[model samples]
Every structure is written in structure tokens, then in C-alpha cells.
Target chain A: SISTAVIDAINSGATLKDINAIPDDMMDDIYSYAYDFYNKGRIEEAEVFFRFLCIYDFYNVDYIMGLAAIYQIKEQFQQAADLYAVAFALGKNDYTPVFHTGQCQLRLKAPLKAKECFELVIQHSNDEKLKIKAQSYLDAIQ
Target chain B: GSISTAVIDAINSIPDDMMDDIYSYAYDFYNKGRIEEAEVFFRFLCIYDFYNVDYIMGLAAIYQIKEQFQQAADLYAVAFALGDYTPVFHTGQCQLRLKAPLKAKECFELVIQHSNDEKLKIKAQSYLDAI
Candidate 1:
């Protein structure tokens, strides 16, 4: 649903402002609130605000990731993996989602898919924590 | 302060389409005993409309039905904090199911103290007496 909305908006040459239904330039403020909720362990409210942000600004990978993380924590692996796919597509330079997707794949018992994502993260990502995490998953699968 | 102003304004303009449509669908699934389907939708509603006690209650009820007493009690507490005394009654029921008579008594007492509904209060009082 969200990915399709983003594609449709992109094809229409609409800017964030054009598609954002919110009354003000509060996207950032709302994201701050969502991130705060996430940090405070209030996953439910964070998800509500993140979903709101994603609908208003589907181009923002951060909002997508925020919602994805909530799903991951709740053990909703499929939803997390799908959102991570969208996040990876939008933020090609950021391999965090790829690594997380690999984790979700592992939980879903798709070792081959997990291996592929981890390999991508290991080969292209420079974040030491992420790289180490990916390597650990790769080793576990081996 | 500036951030809050923007957030407040944006909230006022936020759409309710998902909350209404999804809630109806979730409730229908719940009533039809399609528990898994209902859970997904109720979970969605709870996540996207966190402030609504009805949404929280729906998900909490599902957890209760699934015998996840801890999760049900936690969600019921959330609903109660959101100004719904009915959830306190539900929490008492969950506590009783979990065999925590002490916690159950406290929950029932809260309902009896704060709730004005005569029928609900009577039920809470009966539970308290039994405990």
C-alpha cells in the first residue's frame, strides 16, 4: 500500500508538499515526536506517528524505518522485511535496513535470503556495528 | 515549543479514514472468530490510532482470548490510562484469570471507585467480594 502510493506520487511529479496532507511544515517535528516515542519504549504511539509521517511523506526513509523497527520488535518479520526493502530502495547508501532485513529473514527461517542480504551489507557497508552484526549472522548460518 | 505548535496543528488536520475503516473491518473479523485476521487489523488500529481506547481494547481482548494474560493486562492498563474505566474491569478479569487475586482486587476496586456506570460498578463490586 505504502510503496504503491510512493510510486504513484513519483510518477505524478508531485513534491512532498504537494502530496503531504498535513496542515503545516511539521513533518520534522512529528518525526522528532515519533523518534522520541520509540526511544521511550512507547512503540505503539511511535508507530502511529510514524505511519502518519509515512503517509504524508513517503519519500522519507526514516519514517519507513521507524515503523519497520516497531514491527521487527513485535516479531512481525514479514512486515519488517517488506518495509526494509522499501527503505533500502529509497536509501541505497544506507545498508542498515539490509542488515536488519537479513535478521528478519533469519527469524523467518529463510537462510538463503538472509545470506544474500548479509553479504550485501558486508560487501558495501562501512558501519562497523552493522558490518559486525551482518558477519555474525553470516557465521551463524554457516 | 515551536515543534509542539507544528505537531498540534498537523494533528488537527490528520485524516481519520484508516482508523474508521480499519476499525470496522477489525471488529467484524473479531466477531466472526477469525482471530488471526482480527489480530492483524486490531494491531494496525492500535498502532495507528494509539489514543483510542476502543482500538486498544480490541487488541487487548484478542490477547485475552488467546490466553496471553500478561499482554492483555498490559494493554488493558494502557486503555485505562487513556480514560477508559471499562478496561480496568477487563484488567481485573485478566488478573483473576492469571490467578493474581491481590492485583485483581485492586483493579476491581479502581473500577468501583472511578466508574459511574451502576451495572459495571455492581459487577466490579461482586468481583471484589468474591476475591
Candidate 2:
């Protein structure tokens, strides 16, 4: 339990200013610490920190993505889809959430919804490889 | 940008810790159900982290999925000896898969004693009855 007075604010949640009040190095250290848990297959154990990161920075795409990933790995498709939706809404420039929204939709058996997401992933992305991969999934579903 | 196999190999060979780092990276794919891509990396992780229960259990789970029951059973024995009762339950599953009903019954009995989950305890009992 790496505790500080700041985390009281973290538990209750915070605004961007409250988040920035903590040093950038601290956030990076926190992420590095959690990544060890993430990569070690201790997904549930790593979640508390990621949830805190999300609470601290509700607008932070990285935090959302990390928490969203835990949901994905746990096979909580509905939760993962909701988090991915927030990520896509916040990170309009990032194509990853779109692709994965489709993956989550597929898992939920929402094929038509997944088709739309994959199409968006293909249409909005610049990478031919990604487009090709999305197209393959789309085709396979059809 | 996604790292290439050559790039991963480069960093992996450059430092001792880099290999652990890279192996850990590959395991996230495992966490996401990319089993074929992850199997080799976990085998490597188990090599270095030989006594690491989770790594051993991960490999054993993979072996179980692949229907390599004897191999999974062997690894599960190691995990069980390390005092993780969950793997003892899993080893019983592998034993059953391998058609060793008597061995499986013994394992299930041990699991029933250690496991707290009502569902698991009942399932273990069921297995014992069927065998």
C-alpha cells in the first residue's frame, strides 16, 4: 500500500488540477509498479491501482485504457465495451478502441454492432495492415 | 509501433533482465486469450522462474487445454507441492482426462479438503462419485 495524503483525494476521485498536483514522476512510478503486476498475470491485483488512476484522471485515456484492458482480460465484455466507448469518445484520434470495441461486441454476440465498429476501424485508420485485419474479421463474420 | 520479432530478440539478448521484460510482454497476449502466440513465451517464463507457482500453473493450464494431460499433470504436481491447492484440483482434472480414475479420485479428495468454494467442493465430490 503505497500511501500518501494525495491518495485520499485519489480514493474520493479528483479533477485534472488535483491530479496534476501529484508529480509526473509519481504517476510514472505508479504505472511502472502496476505494469509488473499486469504483466505477471496478477490482473485482479493490478486493478486497484488502475481504478485509482482512472478515478484520479477521468479524462486520461491511458488510465481508461488500462482499466478497460482488465475488463477485457476478465471476459467482462459488457464492462469492457462501456469502457472502450468512453475511450473512443475521449480519444477520437486513437484507432485502437474502435478495433477493440468490435472485438468486445463480437464476444457479446452483437455481430451487427461489431460490424459497424470494424468498418469504422478500417475506414478511419491509416494503417493498411490494420485495415486488412479488420476487413478479415468483417468478412469472416459475414 | 508494434515491435518486430527481430527487435524483441535484439533487446532480449542485450541484457539478462530484458528477456524477463520481453517474456512478461508476451504474457499479456496470453491474458487476452491469444493462446498459440503465448504458449512459447510462458514455457520460457517457466524455465527462468522455475519455482514460480503462477508461471508453472499457467503452463500447466496451457498443457491441459492442449490435451497434453500427462505433461499438465506433471506440472500440476509441482504446483501442488508448492502449496497451491487450486492446482491440486486442476491436477485431478488432468488425471481424469488421462483416464486415471483412481489417481483422480485421490486428488479430488485432497482438493475437497483444502478448497473453500462450495461449488468447487461439490464438483470435486461429484468427480469422486463418478469415478
Candidate 3:
């Protein structure tokens, strides 16, 4: 379902927001197509679309979240953890990246990093349900 | 462990009525990665629980997997019109693939006018501008 040709072209050492390979106008179609893949359960396809788009739109947190979430759901633990690491760096104050990073770390069996992640949430997050869930993960690890 | 265990326990403890059984079975099937099985149960769930977002989304996701884009979109539309905000985005996605640009545009406009989230609003505007 995925189009790796587009993915490969973007990963070919292209600069972020560069004016070369991918057409600026095509992002609309790409974005729509990605979600179409997503909602239609063609997640592998959705992943490639978002993967390239994330590279092209480097500062965009939404695409980062999309790619990370898809990888996590697909059980690509190390890849998801790695992507979430980038997302965490990009959106430190957002809480969402922190929360997802915790989940990914746990999947990677890196419970120590997971503990650190949830601990941050327990300390900083205002959402009680999330705080409780994070606490559960912390307790499960230790 | 805690969440899933607790949830499973609640499901297991439910009375043996058909409605409760269907919901529990569907929920458990999904948790176990039995997606096709879960989709069938959800389709049954929608027959009685027509307004429930969970059942609609479950069946819709399966339809999406099968590339039945229009059917999935129709389910998403019902969920969206019933005031579940999340499904509107799904509806717009399906509309795009169904090649109904005008309806897709209206969906984006709906999100632009009603949604308070800055990101969704901006995304909706992008959709509008794109088409």
C-alpha cells in the first residue's frame, strides 16, 4: 500500500522545505492521501507518506506525531522509540511527545528511560488520567 | 497491566445479556489483535447501538482496511453528525478518496468554523486552500 519511491526520493539527502523534488502544491494531495491511507487502515502506506512529509516539513509536530504513532501501532518498537526521541526533542513542552516516548521506551524494554519519561509526566502533567496511567507504567517497571 | 487487566475484568464480570456480551467480545477481540473478528462484533453492535462512536469507528476502520472507502466514510459521517468531533476529520479523508471535492471542501469548512483547536483550524484552512 505504501509508495516507497516517494519515501526514497525524500530521504535522498534532500534539505528540509527545499524547492526541488517534491512539488510545493502536492502537499495538499499528499496530506489528504496520507490520512486516506490512515483512516482506511492502510497504515503501512500512511507511514511512508508521513515519513517523507515529516522530513520535508521538519518543524511540523503533527507529522512527527503521525509517523511516531503509526510506527508504535505497527509494533516497530525501536523505530518508534527513535522517532519519538526526535519528537521529544522537538516538542519538549507539549507533554504529548513525552507521554508517547514513555510508551515507546517501555516497548523497547528500556524501562529506565520509560521511568524517566513517566516521572516527568507525573511531575508536570495536569491531566489526571494520564498521570495515573503513567504512574501505572512506572509501578509496572519498578 | 493495570488498565487492561481491570478492563478485561469488567468485561468478564458483565451479565450474560447479548448487548453486554457483544460489547465485551468486541472490546476483548480488539485488545487481542483479532481485528477482523472485532469488526464483525462491532457491526453487530451498530445494529443496536447505532449512536455509539466506538462501534461505528471499529467497523469503519475494518471497511477502510478492505478499501471500502465510501462505506467507511458514510459511517464516519454518521458519527460526525452525531456530534463526535473526531469523526469529521475521518469523513473528510474518505470524501477526498471518493473524489467528492465539494463535500470534502464543506467538511473542511465545517471544521474551520466550529473547531476551537488552533491546529485543526489551520489544517482545515489548508484543506480549503488546497482544493
| Model 1 lDDT per residue over B1-131, tens place | 11112222322333677568788998898889899999998877655555476887888889999998866876675454333468778888988999988979877886787677989999999998898
Q: After best superposition, candidate 2 residue A82: deviation in angstroms?
A: 1.3
Superposition error at B131 for model 1 (Å)? 80
Put down candidate 1 lDDT per residue, A1-142, tens digits, no spaces: 3667667866764444465445565767888899999999998899789878766665466877887898898888877776665565445347788889888988999899889889877865668888998999899896
lDDT of 3 by residue, B1-131 (tens): 11112112221222437776788788799889888888778877775555455667777777766678766775664443222245566667667788988878766776776677778878778878888
DockQ for the candidate 3 complex?
Answer: 0.01
Which lDDT values do the candidates have, in the order given?
Answer: 0.73, 0.68, 0.65
Error of 2 at A23 (Å): 2.1
Q: What is the C-alpha RMSD of each candidate to the true structure, in Å?
A: 20.5, 18.2, 22.8
Q: Is the docking of candidate 2 incorrect, acceptable, medium or high quality?
A: incorrect
Candidate 1 displacement at residue A127 in angstroms: 3.0
Stretches of candidate 3 above 4 Å error?
A1-25, B1-131
lDDT of 2 by residue, B1-131 (tens): 01111111211223757765756776787789888877877777765554456777777788889898876766675454332367767878988988888879877887687577878888889989888
Off by over 4 Å in 1: A1-16, A23-25, B1-131
TM-score of chain B of each: 0.82, 0.75, 0.66
Put down candidate 2 lDDT per residue, A1-142, tens digits, no spaces.
Answer: 2356467654554443363666778988877877788999898777777776765566566777787788788887766665665565445335677778788889999999788778766754667878888898999996
Q: Higher lDDT: candidate 1 or 3?
A: 1
Identify the superior model by lDDT, candidate 2 or candidate 3.
2
